[PDB]
Amino acid sequence: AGTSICTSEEWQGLMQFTLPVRLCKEIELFHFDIGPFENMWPGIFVYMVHRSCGTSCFELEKLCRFIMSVKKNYRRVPYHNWKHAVTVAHCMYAILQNNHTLFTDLERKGLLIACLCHDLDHRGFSNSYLQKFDHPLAALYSTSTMEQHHFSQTVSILQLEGHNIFSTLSSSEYEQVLEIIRKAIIATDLALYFGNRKQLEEMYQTGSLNLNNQSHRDRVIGLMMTACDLCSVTKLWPVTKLTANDIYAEFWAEGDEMKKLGIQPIPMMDRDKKDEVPQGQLGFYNAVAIPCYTTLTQILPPTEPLLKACRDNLSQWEKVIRGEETATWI
Numbered sequence: 001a002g003t004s005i006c007t008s009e010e011w012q013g014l015m016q017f018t019l020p021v022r023l024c025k026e027i028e029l030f031h032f033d034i035g036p037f038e039n040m041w042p043g044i045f046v047y048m049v050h051r052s053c054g055t056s057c058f059e060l061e062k063l064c065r066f067i068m069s070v071k072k073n074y075r076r077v078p079y080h081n082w083k084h085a086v087t088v089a090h091c092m093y094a095i096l097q098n099n100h101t102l103f104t105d106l107e108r109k110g111l112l113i114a115c116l117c118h119d120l121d122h123r124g125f126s127n128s129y130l131q132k133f134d135h136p137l138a139a140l141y142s143t144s145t146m147e148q149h150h151f152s153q154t155v156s157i158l159q160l161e162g163h164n165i166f167s168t169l170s171s172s173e174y175e176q177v178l179e180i181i182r183k184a185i186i187a188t189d190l191a192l193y194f195g196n197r198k199q200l201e202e203m204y205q206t207g208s209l210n211l212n213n214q215s216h217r218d219r220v221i222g223l224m225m226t227a228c229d230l231c232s233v234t235k236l237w238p239v240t241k242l243t244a245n246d247i248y249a250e251f252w253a254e255g256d257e258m259k260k261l262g263i264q265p266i267p268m269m270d271r272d273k274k275d276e277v278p279q280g281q282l283g284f285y286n287a288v289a290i291p292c293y294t295t296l297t298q299i300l301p302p303t304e305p306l307l308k309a310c311r312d313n314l315s316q317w318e319k320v321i322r323g324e325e326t327a328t329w330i
């Protein structure tokens, strides 16, 4: 109930934080895994913002309050949590650094912030669940239900005293950046990904894709958001596999609630159907992840390492299906 706010100790601590020198080099790479460095995650975000947008893009105090308050409004759920927020932001940083001048200063700061915020106050339940059981949120937001809520949470945090990192923008640039963030967060609704990707593949293959056309830009940015949101599938296999365990803990908890409401879940959400998981992953990679990174690589050639890693992980799920897995730790 209400919007949570960080403590003075929390944001002052982030302000004083210094990143270890060895990580500077690592943070630039797509395959970088934030996993082993939990205490450093908010500092890693400050560092990314500073490298991409400059140390004077945001007032430091407001930025540190914003970040630690964003952390506090992520819930202690197995997957859609603070750790996922930072992984997705780190992916966008790597895409931006590799394609820096294609995007405006306004886009870069808006997109890094949109990624950190894009799953804010997630409860561990899908849009499917919310709409099936008529949660109050599905009443307010008929489509892209959680994603409209995530944007609303983003705006609530900007409105806390001393948290508005965008105040110093011109009134016109302020409206523009909030629209960038809104569109980017809405785009993380995978329901919209399928149409967006299909349209982009068409525009690319006919050569009509034009980044000077606002509706095209919006679409490319949309696909960036998908690519960052799904980026666990572009890490090294052990990291990808561990994250999948977290995703499924959420799914299985949702399916458990459905059974309580008299309805059997989709197999993916049924903890009594774990044998079906590897085939389900194969279907997910073939239908979503591979086409996403394939199209993104056509449009932004330097994102190619995301696609190569995704392909390597598809191969590992194929090994699992064939019974060729080796020892795994949980």
Ligand SMILES: OCc1ccc2c(c1)OCCO2
Residues within 6 Å of the ligand: 229, 230, 231, 232, 233, 247, 280, 281, 284
């Ligand atoms: O982050 C990778 C990822 C996101 C969503 C998924 C997923 C993996 O696998 C099963 C369906 O949903």
Ligand code: NI
Residues within 6 Å of the ligand: 118, 119, 146, 188
């Ligand atoms: Ni989401």
Ligand code: NI
Residues within 6 Å of the ligand: 084, 088, 118, 119, 188, 229
């Ligand atoms: Ni997400």
